[PDB]
Design an enzyme around this catalytic site. Structure first.
Site, PDB file in Angstrom:
ATOM      1  N   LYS A   9       0.992  -1.230  -0.205  1.00 13.79           N
ATOM      2  CA  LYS A   9       0.028  -0.090   0.176  1.00 13.79           C
ATOM      3  C   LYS A   9       0.777   1.398   0.029  1.00 13.79           C
ATOM      4  O   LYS A   9       2.127   1.191   0.158  1.00 13.79           O
ATOM      5  CB  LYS A   9      -1.115   0.065   1.427  1.00 13.79           C
ATOM      6  CG  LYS A   9      -2.084  -1.169   1.147  1.00 13.79           C
ATOM      7  CD  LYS A   9      -2.857  -1.389   2.495  1.00 13.79           C
ATOM      8  CE  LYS A   9      -3.810  -2.233   2.148  1.00 13.79           C
ATOM      9  NZ  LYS A   9      -4.597  -2.448   3.589  1.00 13.79           N
ATOM     10  N   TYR A  49     -12.387  -3.175  -3.575  1.00 14.81           N
ATOM     11  CA  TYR A  49     -13.190  -3.157  -2.237  1.00 14.81           C
ATOM     12  C   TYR A  49     -14.768  -3.067  -2.201  1.00 14.81           C
ATOM     13  O   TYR A  49     -15.377  -2.363  -1.581  1.00 14.81           O
ATOM     14  CB  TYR A  49     -12.861  -1.768  -1.463  1.00 14.81           C
ATOM     15  CG  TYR A  49     -11.185  -1.948  -1.084  1.00 14.81           C
ATOM     16  CD1 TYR A  49     -10.778  -2.846   0.000  1.00 14.81           C
ATOM     17  CD2 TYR A  49     -10.179  -0.882  -1.288  1.00 14.81           C
ATOM     18  CE1 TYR A  49      -9.376  -3.089   0.488  1.00 14.81           C
ATOM     19  CE2 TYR A  49      -8.963  -1.042  -0.767  1.00 14.81           C
ATOM     20  CZ  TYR A  49      -8.520  -2.004  -0.022  1.00 14.81           C
ATOM     21  OH  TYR A  49      -7.183  -2.262   0.316  1.00 14.81           O
ATOM     22  N   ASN A 112      -1.761   0.038   7.258  1.00  8.08           N
ATOM     23  CA  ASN A 112      -1.270  -1.457   7.700  1.00  8.08           C
ATOM     24  C   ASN A 112      -0.434  -2.000   6.539  1.00  8.08           C
ATOM     25  O   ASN A 112      -0.124  -3.186   6.251  1.00  8.08           O
ATOM     26  CB  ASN A 112      -2.432  -2.337   8.196  1.00  8.08           C
ATOM     27  CG  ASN A 112      -3.172  -2.683   6.993  1.00  8.08           C
ATOM     28  OD1 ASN A 112      -3.255  -1.994   5.729  1.00  8.08           O
ATOM     29  ND2 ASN A 112      -4.013  -3.603   6.986  1.00  8.08           N
ATOM     30  N   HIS A 115      -1.484  -5.533   1.557  1.00  5.48           N
ATOM     31  CA  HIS A 115      -2.848  -6.503   1.394  1.00  5.48           C
ATOM     32  C   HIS A 115      -2.385  -7.642   0.835  1.00  5.48           C
ATOM     33  O   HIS A 115      -1.422  -7.822  -0.124  1.00  5.48           O
ATOM     34  CB  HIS A 115      -3.767  -5.495   0.525  1.00  5.48           C
ATOM     35  CG  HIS A 115      -4.650  -6.531  -0.209  1.00  5.48           C
ATOM     36  ND1 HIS A 115      -5.964  -6.867   0.527  1.00  5.48           N
ATOM     37  CD2 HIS A 115      -4.817  -7.351  -1.271  1.00  5.48           C
ATOM     38  CE1 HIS A 115      -6.572  -7.779  -0.297  1.00  5.48           C
ATOM     39  NE2 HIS A 115      -5.787  -7.997  -1.396  1.00  5.48           N
ATOM     40  N   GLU A 126      -8.697 -11.022  -7.672  1.00  2.24           N
ATOM     41  CA  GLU A 126      -7.865  -9.648  -7.680  1.00  2.24           C
ATOM     42  C   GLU A 126      -6.744  -9.609  -8.785  1.00  2.24           C
ATOM     43  O   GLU A 126      -6.424  -8.707  -9.130  1.00  2.24           O
ATOM     44  CB  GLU A 126      -7.253  -9.632  -5.888  1.00  2.24           C
ATOM     45  CG  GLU A 126      -8.337  -9.210  -5.038  1.00  2.24           C
ATOM     46  CD  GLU A 126      -7.961  -9.274  -3.558  1.00  2.24           C
ATOM     47  OE1 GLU A 126      -6.758  -9.886  -3.468  1.00  2.24           O
ATOM     48  OE2 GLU A 126      -8.613  -9.135  -2.866  1.00  2.24           O
TER      49      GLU A 126
END
Lengths: 149, 149, 149, 149, 149, 149
Positions: A9, A49, A112, A115, A126
């Site tokens: 990310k 998402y 965080n 992913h 994905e």
């Protein structure tokens, strides 16, 4: 072999953790099949998402994942989806154990760092969403017979 | 002090993890008392894997552990047998946690990089099976009083 | 391929640098052919340091290299003798550059952590002096074709 | 943000683990607010270990923590007290998991390398006991917005 | 033994290199005698950079070194002043070789991460300028006889 | 800022050095602007190695660089072209110094792990040959003001 989608990310790129993360997957024995540095479009992110489309934080999530470049990856190997998740650690860095990527490298669930696909089926979603099939490279590791029987 | 037997298997040597593995035991504070690079004979391997003599995979196990050189080691310290096993991680790399040798470095139980004695009694068996007693070196670490009270 | 003799001296073992040193040779691409943990006898040491038999510090040198266990190694590869010396760094840690083993890890020439053969001919002397020929293991790296054309 | 007190004990300094330990907290994303190299006085130590004043080992504990220099630190961040403890691992290195500081680096509870505040309230006690308030430096990380939302 | 002054500059702290830098000095074998996290006053900085008092960039230099906290250190050992400088690398990161602190970790001379005393005499100036003599801790390494004859 | 093209060759991928290499550029302070995992076409390779079109080894060079996937990268920063080359080390691993990528990780010029642009002008050629301009991502590091004045 099985394949999973892993994205570093914006905060993981900003904090200089790209080589660190890729090293964990290489040294484990998993095979890099896809690698790509991009700014994910809000559209692409909205599709990614989609199970959180109706959740409230969704707007912010898509805004943030668009705020900077991500490293999109595809990795391959025996149980790479579940093992990948074990290697990333708990989604909330606070429940992540030392030794894992989120455990070692970050603090807050909103930042965080990484992913990973949560299931084989979401992995396939994905990979298909993020990669053109000609962007996925197939080759044999010199170490394959020492990684698998 | 207590002693355990640790062997780096053919895939661990092939994949260049020898220095990595030894480093984990050194930095923990355990004392190297035996170190030896060999090709284990099928006979030696048969004695080593004697509790699996009647299991079916036995033939392949002995064939594989003979397929290349192994690094045989003896390490010493408080609870080194159980702690050694904790440091190696679960025998099946799939249940091994990040931070452990098998957790960090391998994927499949058939190519699981390393062996450690499972009990004090099997440790003593294996040390005696793999090492001559004059191959075991005794010395005092300069750091001993900072490792133990 | 060419082979060199590398010994980790008592201070290198005491200071927990065994895995670190082995890792440098593995990650470079050199092949481990011999590995052995011993206390070198004063006789063996006298033969090893024979070109300094009439130098004065000789007595102390042999006394020190006997003062604790050493890790004797044989490594193999293209120009491993000269490259191994480059990797160790200058014999006097004071002239050793950062990035090298002596440059990174030690300070004084009397405690300089490691030995490497200075010539192909002294390499062959030292391998023969320290290893029985059946202690030298021959195998092919899975990575060989990616290390050499 | 929340703050915790972490002290590297005499054995951690002796064994050259200071930079290793600080690196774990930096790479996690926590902010160094205080750093100090000292020999803790028996008085200061008595106040620090006051909940064990009437325990028997107390005398030895204070004697040992006075036996050499300690690195006193203050770190800051979301849940740094509990996360810090997770990062240190179990107080008894024997229950400490690989990946953690005590799990990776030490063996025995009497030589367990490091201390961390066990509660927010004891954190505030210890910071106040070990640091003058002008010794605590406040600044903003360049990475803050990538560590926190 | 000889002593040198090493300061990690604001950019080194901001970029999370404190533990990394301290680790290089520990693993080399040098002894930490002073450690201190501060914001250097413009006055203290003016005295530190006094040989550049009349140079033009001086104003900016003092402004920058005051812009954030620095880690002030004193390290001790055989030739630590010159070796320390070798370990830092060239003052201009552009002439710094890989393996050194500036070579590995930074780019531009104005953000060059670290300072080390350039001479034994400037070392003594700087230690005296930055540290109270009771802030300097004397102890014996457990590894001393393995670092020095 | 200035930009250079760096390609990790088939042997660098095969040997699990991708994360290691990327980490060196990140930790130095350079900015990743392009990242891409591909099998370079013989045509693309022929254009890349055009100054060697009439040299004899050319055929083999193009055959080899096509033999497996490469990681194509674009990195940006002050003097990144020359510094990048310093970081890679000498083109012949035999002249490469410890601390550099080729110095640390490979042996033979035919399997020398990595490519970096040799000039600003060849950098611009290669970036243009290997990347579409929309594959180059522009963003600001959080650490920029701590990397540059």
């Amino acid at each position: 072999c099985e394949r999973t989608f892993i994205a570093i990310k914006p905060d993981g790129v900003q904090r200089g953790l790209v080589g660190e993360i890729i090293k964990r997957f290489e040294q484990k024995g998993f095979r890099l099949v896809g690698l790509k540095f991009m700014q994910a479009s809000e559209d692409l992110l909205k599709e990614h998402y989609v199970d959180l489309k109706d959740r409230p934080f969704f707007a912010g999530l898509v805004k943030y994942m668009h705020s900077g470049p991500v490293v999109a990856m595809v990795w391959e190997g025996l149980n790479v989806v579940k093992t990948g998740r074990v290697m990333l650690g708990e989604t909330n860095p606070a429940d992540s154990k030392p030794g894992t990527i989120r455990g070692d490298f970050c603090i807050q669930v909103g930042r965080n760092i990484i992913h990973g696909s949560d299931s084989v089926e979401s992995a396939e979603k994905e990979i298909g969403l993020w990669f053109h099939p000609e962007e996925l490279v197939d080759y044999t590791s010199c170490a394959q017979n020492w990684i698998y029987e």
